[PDB]
């Protein structure tokens, strides 16, 4: 039992490092304390930030779309490193990714957030929570719930080795709509759940019931995703450019 | 064997189970006995259509609205039972009163649908303390938007029931649900987290002892909390539609208060 589980944890960690350029460890060192990020706290600061790194709200949402598309490819590469994933039915792999990416994106974005803002462009920039909140509707309320979630998620003080297994657990969710063969997805998630539990007990022996607390955060996470999707529909309100997004 | 710290967790499990039985008059054990025909004395009358619905009241609105009103007022009575159970959870009544109200406000419906699953199979749901059984098909046939009210609960129930939890398991699970430190507007999160920590420990051990062959049942149970939240979020929205389309339909103030700015 045990050998399999520590091999799985190390493997996922190594893959996670390969696939995700800006890890939580690198990000936390930026948000605490040789180069600080360029801080975007203003309309004017945003203007200069573009010179360094139609209107303001729309241009930021577009940058945000670009970043999303990058992140989905990172996540897809990672998913394919999870033992068993590529041997699943192809439709099912596509379904797991389709419904998993948003959960994964905002989980991992918490690594780049504190209560005051979020790192951008590989940690070269920092956009303040208040600046994003000041954007005119409906853009002003776009990131706020992700910040609220992140504050609660970051209080678990998970590190990259923990998160690598948790993200894999998220990917292997057997309740996604339209799955054809749920059994092996649950079988793999069971194994990943065992590996996460062990990892959190070995890595954080003093955090009582960290495993249970982490799993419970999915409830808030799925809430934020459903709100996000609804807002995206509301926002839908160069052809080749429209196609990519 | 058991050590002193795990012994205390067993005592807590037993206390919660005991309070659960005293608080909730129709248990999963009784519901399953009714449903699976351990019965000559316990057989329900089955409501599957208009004429059988009529006959059921022997043992004035329209059909869809009358059922919904009955469903409403049973909800209220269930909130009462959950509130009396909550008081039994050690530490709960010692919390800030405002936090007691917040925890109930956000937790009571997640508990309602957890326990409703006990009274459901794929074909319908037990009603009136298990004396009746209303079919899923009949409910789904009610006019819009009432016909889609209960379907999400059935879909959740069938998956939840595959975990094969018993009342002793459920008693600790519903306590964990109530003592969530991540509910919005809580004043003092720490004391709540400390209670849940202990409850989570007691649930883990309970599932290990009661279901030793069921791998990661604890994790799989905790994952179902997300389904519950999604039910409650959706259910609320459907209520707002119903209110607006039926200006003559009354919502009980307890329920209206619970959903207010949720
Ligand atoms: C920004 C705008 C729109 C979407 N969307 O269409 O879903 C997503 C985002 C977003 O959050 N992208 C992102 C991903 C990862 C890190 C930062 C930003
Ligand atoms: C039925 C109709 C309306 C509401 N509501 O307004 O919230 C709720 C319900 C309902 O779920 N009733 C119920 C819950 C649990 C067990 C039996 C009946």
Swiss-Prot record, chain B:
Chain positions of motif 9aaTAD: 253-261
- GO term, biological process aspect, one: cell fate commitment
| Effect noted on mutating residue 22 to R | More than 50% loss of ubiquitination
* A cellular component annotation (GO) from this entry: nucleoplasm
Q: Where's the NR LBD domain?
A: 8-261
Q: Tell me the residues linked by Glycyl lysine isopeptide (Lys-Gly) (interchain with G-Cter in ubiquitin).
A: 22
Function, as annotated, reads: Nuclear receptor that binds peroxisome proliferators such as hypolipidemic drugs and fatty acids. Once activated by a ligand, the nuclear receptor binds to DNA specific PPAR response elements (PPRE) and modulates the transcription of its target genes, such as acyl-CoA oxidase. It therefore controls the peroxisomal beta-oxidation pathway of fatty acids. Key regulator of adipocyte differentiation and glucose homeostasis. ARF6 acts as a key regulator of the tissue-specific adipocyte P2 (aP2) enhancer. (Microbial infection) Upon treatment with M.tuberculosis or its lipoprotein LpqH, phosphorylation of MAPK p38 and IL-6 production are modulated, probably via this protein.
Q: Which disease is it linked to?
A: Defects in PPARG can lead to type 2 insulin-resistant diabetes and hyptertension. PPARG mutations may be associated with colon cancer.
Say which family it is in: Belongs to the nuclear hormone receptor family. NR1 subfamily.
Protein's name according to its UniProt entry:
Peroxisome proliferator-activated receptor gamma
**Biological source species:** Homo sapiens (Human)
Q: Which residues of the full protein are shown?
A: 231 to 504 of 505
């Amino acid at each position: 039992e045990s050998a399999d589980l520590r091999a799985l944890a190390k493997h996922l960690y190594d893959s996670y490092i390969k696939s995700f350029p800006l890890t939580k460890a690198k990000a936390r060192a930026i948000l605490t304390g040789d180069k600080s990020p360029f801080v975007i706290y203003d309309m004017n600061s945003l203007m200069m930030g573009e010179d360094k790194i139609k209107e303001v709200a729309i241009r930021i949402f577009q940058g945000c779309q670009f970043r999303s598309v990058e992140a989905v490819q990172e996540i897809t590469e990672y998913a394919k490193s999870i033992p068993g994933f590529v041997n699943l039915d192809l439709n099912d792999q596509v379904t797991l990714l389709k419904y998993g990416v948003h959960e994964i994106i905002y989980t991992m974005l918490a690594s780049l957030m504190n209560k005051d803002g979020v790192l951008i462009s590989e940690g070269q920039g920092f956009m303040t929570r208040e600046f994003l909140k000041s954007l005119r509707k409906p853009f002003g309320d776009f990131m706020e719930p992700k910040f609220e979630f992140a504050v609660k998620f970051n209080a678990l003080e998970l590190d990259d080795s923990d998160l690598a297994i948790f993200i894999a657990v998220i990917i292997l969710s057997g309740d996604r709509p339209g799955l054809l063969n749920v059994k092996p997805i649950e079988d793999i998630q069971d194994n990943l759940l065992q590996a996460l539990e062990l990892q959190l007990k070995l890595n954080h022996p003093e955090s009582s019931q960290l495993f249970a607390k982490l799993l419970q955060k999915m409830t808030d996470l799925r809430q934020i995703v459903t709100e996000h999707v609804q807002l995206l529909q509301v926002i839908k309100k160069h052809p080749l450019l429209q196609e990519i997004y």
